[PDB]
Structures are given as C-alpha cells and as structure tokens.
Design a protein around this ligand. Sequence first.
Ligand code: SF4
Lengths: 117, 83, 204, 466
Amino acid sequence: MDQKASYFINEKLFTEVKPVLFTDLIHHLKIGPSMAKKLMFDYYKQTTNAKYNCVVICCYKDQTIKIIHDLSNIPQQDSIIDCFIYAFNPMDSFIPYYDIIDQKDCLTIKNSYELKV
Amino acid sequence: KRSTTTLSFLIKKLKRQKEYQTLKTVCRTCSYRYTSDAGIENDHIASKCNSYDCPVFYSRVKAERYLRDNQSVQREEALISLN
Amino acid sequence: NRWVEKWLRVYLKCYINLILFYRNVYPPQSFDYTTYQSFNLPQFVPINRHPALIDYIEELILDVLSKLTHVYRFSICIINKKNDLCIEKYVLDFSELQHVDKIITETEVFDEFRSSLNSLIMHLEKLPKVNDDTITFEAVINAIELELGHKLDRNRRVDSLEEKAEIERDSNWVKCQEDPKIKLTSLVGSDVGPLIIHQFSEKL
Amino acid sequence: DLHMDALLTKFNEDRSLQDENLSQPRTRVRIVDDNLYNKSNPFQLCYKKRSQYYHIYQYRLKTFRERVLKECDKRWDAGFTLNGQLVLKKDKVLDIQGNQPCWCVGSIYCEMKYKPNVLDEVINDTYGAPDLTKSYTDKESDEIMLEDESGRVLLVGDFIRSTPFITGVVVGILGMEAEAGTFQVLDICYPTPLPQNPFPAPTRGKIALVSGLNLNNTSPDRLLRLEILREFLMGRINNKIDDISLIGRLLICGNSVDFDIKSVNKDELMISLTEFSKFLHNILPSISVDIMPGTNDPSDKSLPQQPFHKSLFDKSLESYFNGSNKEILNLVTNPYEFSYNGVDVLAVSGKNINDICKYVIPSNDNFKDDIEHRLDLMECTMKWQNIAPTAPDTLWCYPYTDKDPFVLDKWPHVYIVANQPYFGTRVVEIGGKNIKIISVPEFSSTGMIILLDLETLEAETVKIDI
Ligand code: SF4
C-alpha cells in the first residue's frame, strides 16, 4: 500500500531497533513475496535521510544465492537472474532473530498433506 | 513431554559410550603390536588382555561394568518418557 | 526477586561485555560471539573468554545485584590512563526499577533486552574507533541510603561464605563525588512490567 | 558492469506481481514413502536388549564366501580354459602350487595402520595411553595376503595394486604361481549381483539433500544460511513457483547440531534444539521434512542410530508428533531405505566411509584425500555388499542375531553418503545393475544442497553464500 508498509518499516527500524525482513512484510500485510520485494524497493527510494544498512542478495544462474558484501565488484553480472533487497539493517552486524510464526494464510506453497488433529 | 531430564540422560550415556569407544580404540592399537591386524579378531584378542599393571585395563573394565549397570533401567525410563 | 535477578544479571553481563568489546577496552581477538555463557543470552553477544575478566565481571554484577535495594544508578566510566580523566560514561538508570514486592514470560523480557542492546550497539557503532595500548574502564554507582567500608569495625568474625561475601562486598567500594562539552544521548531501555530500566550515554 | 542501484532499479521496477493470488496457493508435488508402515525396518533395534563381534564376523564370512563361490562357479565353471591350459579349482590356500592357473576364495589381509591424528586424539583422552607410535614403529609393510582358513599367500602383480582393499573382504583371486609362495593376480571375483527393484518408468518431483547443519551456539552465520535455505525452499527467494513446487520433500542427513559431548550441559543443547524446532515449525507447513541422526547429533555413537525421540523439540511441534501426522514429519533410523515414489534410495550419514578414511593403508599406490578416492571407496562398498567394512570402528555390540542388516540384501536405486568433505556423483555398473552414488557435503562450510530428480536421477546443486 506504500503507506502501511512504510510506517511499519519505520517503526521496526527506529522505535524498536531491529532489522526488518521482507518476510516480515509478507507476514504483516498478507502479501506475496514479489509485492513485498517491490514495497522494499519503494521504501529504498524516497530515503533522503538514510540511517540504515541495506542487505541485498542476488540469484545467479544454476540456482546460486549470494549475499553482496563488496558492493563494488559483483562477479558474473551477466548471469544474474534476480536481485532484490533482503533486509534493512540499522546496525553493522546483521545477526537477525527468529521466532515462532503462524503462517495461517500467508503461505504461497503448501504441502499436499494437511495437519490432522 | 520432558526435554530436561531426558537430555541429561542422553548426555551421560553418550559421554560414557564415547569414553568406552576411546578405551577400546586404545586397547586395539596397543594389541596391534602382537596381532599386526586392524579389522576383526584384533579387538577380540585385545578384549582378553588382563594386565594389572596398566590403568587402561582398569578404566576399560570399569566402563564395561558401567554400560551393563543400572543404566538399563535408565533406558527404560527414557522409553516411557518418550512414548 | 524470583526471576528478576537472573534476567538482570544477564542484561548486565551483555551490557558490560558489549561496552568492553566496542570501545576496545580489551583486544577483539579475546571476544567470541555466543548465546550461552552459563545463561541463555538474548542475542549473540560477544563475551570475553579471559577467566580473570569473567570472574571480575561476575563478581561486580553480583555485588550490584546485592546492593540493588539501595542503588538507583549504575555507570561504567571510560577513563584514560595517560591522565585520570573520564571521556565516556554509560549510565543505566534504576529509578526504583519497579521492584517486585510480591513474574512474566521470559520471551518478552528477552525481546525488550534485544531492543535495548540493539539501541546500544547502534549508538556504539557510530562512535570513533578507540586505540589499544592502555585504555581502561571503571565502575561507578549512585546510591540513596547506604554507607560502605564501615562493616570492619567489629572484627567481623566470619562463620560461612555468605558473611565473608558480605564483608568483602561492603569493603570493595570507595566514596567518590559527582565529578564543559558533555553530550547526553538517551537510549532505549526496557518498558516491561517487572523491569523498568532507562539507558543513558555520555561523551566528551 | 554497473552500480548496485542500477541493477536494483532494473530488476525491482519490472516485478511480475502475477500468479500470486495467495488465496489458492500452489500445491506441492506429492512424494510418498512406501516404507512408512510396510514391515520390518532392518535397522530398527532395541536399546534395552543391548564381545559379540565374533558372531557377526562368522556370519559375514559365511555369507560372503557363499556368494563369492556362487559367482566363481557361474564365471569359472568347469571347462573354462586359459590361454595355455585349463584352470583348476583349489579349496585351500596350500593347494595352489604348480605351473597351472588356479583360483581360490579367501579374505584379504592388509596393514591398515591408524592415522597419527586419531592416535593423538585417543591418547589425549585416556589418561594412561602408552606411546602408540611405538606399536607401529617397532614393526617397521606394503603387501597383501589372502587368508582362507588354511594360510596366506602374497598377492603380487599389477591387477591387485590398482584396487583399494580393506582387511576382511573376501574375493575370488584367479592367478598363477610363478617362482615362490607368492601368487599372481589376473582376475578378481566379487559377490554375485543382488536383485534390484525395477525402475518406475511413468508427474514426478525432486528431493533436497542437505546435511551438516551443525547448529552451534558460537557461529550465527549457520543460522543465517539455514534461514536462507528455509526461505528458498518455500519459494520466497527464487519467485519461480513452477520449479520450487517440484521439490516434494526435504531430507536432513544428520549433523543437525554440533557440540562437544565431553564437556556439555543441557541448557546450550536445549537452545540449539529450540532453534532447530523453530526452523522446523516455520518450514513444516510448506514442505515435508525427514530427519536423520548424525555422528555429533544427540543419538547413539554406533552406526545404527535410532530415531531421536518425541521429546527434544519445542511444544509448538506437539501436533506433528501425535502419530497421525507422519507424512509431513518423520524421524528415522540413521541407515534407511526410502521408497520415494518407488525409487528405493539408501541413505547413510557417512560414518562408515569416515571410519574407513581414518586408516592409512600402505597399499594402492596407483588419490590422496580426494573426491575420486572416496568415490572409489563407496563403489567398493557396493561391490563388497558390505555397508560397514570396518565393523570394530562403526558397528557396536549386538548388531543382530544371525542376520546382519549391514550386509546388503538388495541394491538400491540411489546411494547417498552425507557429511563428506566434497560433493560428487558417479553411476556404477555392477553385474548389469546401475546404482547412483551421491556424496553430500557439509552445510556448515560450503552450504550446498543437492536436488535429486526422481524421474531422471540428476543431481543439481544449490549454493548459498551466507
Ligand atoms: S594392556 Fe593396557 S594398553 Fe595394553 S591393551 Fe590391555 S589395556 Fe590396552
């Protein structure tokens, strides 16, 4: 929506200092991964006051995933099939934290079987 | 559902088993002097050594007795808790 | 004082270790990132592995926890060694701490500790790098109603380890005073029920 | 070739934003295990029942000798003449004496001295271990004998040199005595080929092979790699559901957590298991998970490691452990044969090959710690039909009674050995059958995962930087 997402990212980046992932947007706004990546890219713009570190990862050919560190010399730029922003890090060391997540209706792929109680 | 006591039981049992395995490996390596063999029938020969002048023999027999000790009841307790 | 002591000790350990690591009080090679240091830390906090330093930090934290009933402010001061002057001060407010006269799930406590430590780390990262070769730290507390160093006037015939610990903790502090371009930067503390802690920092 | 901002603008502004309804998510391809409830898991033992190696050795010797005799009778039957004369059958080692070709069956004897690092490791943790190097230096070598209950003969030649051998393995040496009690080697016979299930020709999905998670309380980068793997398997990163939905199952092949059992307590291990349970709970609703015990996992030090427990997992996973939900989560014995849509695959955490590699063998002059050498070792393991050639190292007391499961009874379609230093695949043709050998690398370092196709048996790798 470019408004709720921006407000949530600002809160999670400044009020409670914690790195924010695009999966956080997926779980919060109930949107697909592509929409979350687009919203993250939109928030990357209109950022004249940049007070965070962007963690960007790219998908090479032959199904290879790499985390960009040098940000100056990316090897094999011709083989890149996708490149997006993975997270916004307010600190230098990323080191995120993982908790229990209820993926009730935010799943894009589900296994053929269902949990039986 | 208990992940505290059972975890300690596995810790103790695995430490004991690894100590026993280390003792058996040392005994096999020492018995290689006479056997000059590495596979089976070397550890079998090493298990028949009863030298009272080496502490490794005492440690090995203590570990063997402890494996056959009340730990069988401890294994049964773990089985009941797991189920 | 049921679960408050453990969480407070963990938070103090993380605070002291982070301040030591990020201000180059001790060589960074002696620190390792870990989650367990006899207590499940809220994050991967770099903790020094020098046994003497670990014992010193644990003793200081235990003394502070013992005196918590009368101390309302804990500060770790960074003092140069070429001259005995404080250049950086980190203040940990204890305004009654919302003391448990009579207690909440650990997850929210660790989340609040994570927020506070992340704020501290973010503030520490932008600070200028500190050189090695004899930069040291110091511990100062602000008290309300107490008097230390006066428990050794009765020959203090000890009977158990508790009495010896009390005597050595009473005599391990000295009286100091309150003492330009002081810059005050408030940080994020914990707003959970049992623990109400405010965080401060000083520069120059 | 361009700045990062240029690439970000080029890729993100042209987002598809299609097929992501999120109300009718794409169903993962169905992959089943036919061995979930059939019968008689061969590697499922009883810990309560608990040197017994003599019976195992006798059974192995009898079975292998019978199989090698059957193969030799099939191949070296009466009437088979060599270039010069006819080959004779000799029952004992002392009967091969003359200027005529002959063949006999017996076990192989080698040196197989321990590596110095293993010796140092066991000496430092014994408190009284002697100078074991003296046990190897006093003898002061490079030769192979053939023992068949009547003596030994030196196996000279060139055909015997270009083949790795382990002591206790029986073969069908066929050679000629030349000038002494040394026997030449011309051809070697192995146990007769075992039956194999027919290939299920047909839609079909793939399975992910990952091992060596090594969830530690000191390295947080491994947690990052595990989270990236979790995101990739759910289709959040690749954004191509048409290919991600084909990954039917995820297979962890041991070494989930790494710790020092000599000095360990419950709290840190519990933290690591809670992290593992969080990962499982966050990955279970999207894909099925099969978990294998590892060498450093909290399971038995022996090779037949039983399933972990219903415990040692967070209370959020209690719904999966009620017993009715086994197709989405399954804890299994360390050696197992999954019948993935009719494709029988044999999985080993790699303790057998690792135990073989801790021996220095002053033989096989014509690789040193290379992928080719380990692949040859695995191929020999299939050739000998013995999963664990080094029984005193991998096997424990009382494997079984009169029927050792580690002696192969049916060749699988795909062979997996995990926790190996390097990745490699090789298909071998043994007796008209085809077995695919897969070497799964550790995930802690060079965190590659293997995507195995169940319709064409092709292994493609996915590498994650950090
Ligand atoms: S004597 Fe001591 S060392 Fe030699 S084998 Fe028996 S135990 Fe091992």
